[PDB]
């Protein structure tokens, strides 16, 4: 009861803030908070590119577990679409091109929320020390191009823009 001293003992909605019943809308609005000393910049994308899918997944799991252990707010841990390159090698005596093989490179991206300069230095040192063989590591800021890389093209939108121009 409101007048009883035990009022609000069942108050629980302030202990949890996950009340977003939306279909799939994402925020994607964390600007880099750069205040000079507490340089808590924005979300960062860590890309791991590898031909070996198992190795790429293993290193993505390792870096995600390391982020969880180091109290790093991991925004996402997803996979970009694979790229399948075809090798066309020039046959002996020249003037020919034959199919050699196909290489499917896979990219695993971990989106982290916030970080500081010293901890970023330590984290980069650890990552580059524990990097496996034949894996490309990239550390970037989350931009609109990176966000749209996962999404597919818009041929109709491009045609409409071309007609407008």
């Amino acid at each position: 009861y409101r007048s009883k001293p035990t009022h609000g003992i069942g108050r629980y909605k302030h202990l949890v803030k996950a009340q977003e019943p939306k279909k799939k809308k994402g925020k994607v609005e964390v600007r880099p908070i750069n205040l000079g000393t507490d340089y808590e910049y924005g979300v960062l994308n860590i890309h791991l590119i590898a031909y070996d899918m198992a190795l790429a997944e293993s290193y993505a799991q390792y870096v995600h577990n390391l982020c969880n252990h180091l109290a790093i707010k991991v925004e996402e841990s997803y996979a970009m679409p694979t790229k399948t390159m075809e090798v066309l090698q020039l046959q002996e005596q020249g003037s020919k091109m034959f199919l050699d093989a196909v290489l499917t490179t896979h990219e695993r991206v971990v989106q982290i929320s916030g970080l500081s300069a010293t901890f970023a230095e330590i984290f980069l040192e650890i990552i580059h020390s524990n990097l496996p063989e034949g894996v490309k590591l990239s550390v970037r800021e989350h931009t609109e191009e990176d966000f749209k890389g996962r999404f597919k093209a818009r041929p109709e939108l491009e045609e409409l823009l071309a007609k407008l121009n």
Partner: peptide
């Protein structure tokens, strides 16, 4: 009308602000 609690509240120790940095238990056990 409001009355003062006769002792400490159960969930008054944990901080409401910055829930993401507070560890949770994910086990019903």
């Amino acid at each position: 009308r409001r009355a003062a609690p006769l002792g400490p509240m159960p969930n008054e120790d944990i901080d409401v602000s910055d829930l993401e940095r507070l560890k949770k238990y994910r086990s019903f056990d």
